[PDB]
Structure 1
Amino acid sequence: CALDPLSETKCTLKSFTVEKGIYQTSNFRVQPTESIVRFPNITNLCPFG
């Protein structure tokens, strides 16, 4: 069930031979990459100077 896409098509059904047609065999999602996003800037500096 993870060799060829034809094998996955066979595995979605229960037949060793498949005729002409199109079948949804799996659903895919774009896995997000490793990155983050920022925060608003500092309003002022430290009250220590």
Structure 2
Amino acid sequence: EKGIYQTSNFRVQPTESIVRFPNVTNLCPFHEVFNATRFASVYAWNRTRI
């Protein structure tokens, strides 16, 4: 019928997504374990942490 009707709401959609995290600090000492002058023994095990 003649008149003005309320329909579905509109949105302006985003065009891209961005992800921001702080500067990456130093890494776990995995390099020292694998890129070693001599490999570690079963008793000389490491505990990577924090």
| TM category, shorter | 0.3 to 0.5
Task: Name the TM-score, length of structure 1 as normaliser.
Answer: 0.33
Higher-helix-fraction structure:
1
With CA pairs under 8 Å and 6+ residues apart, which has the higher RCO, 1 or 2? Answer: 2
Task: Name the TM-score, length of structure 2 as normaliser.
Answer: 0.33
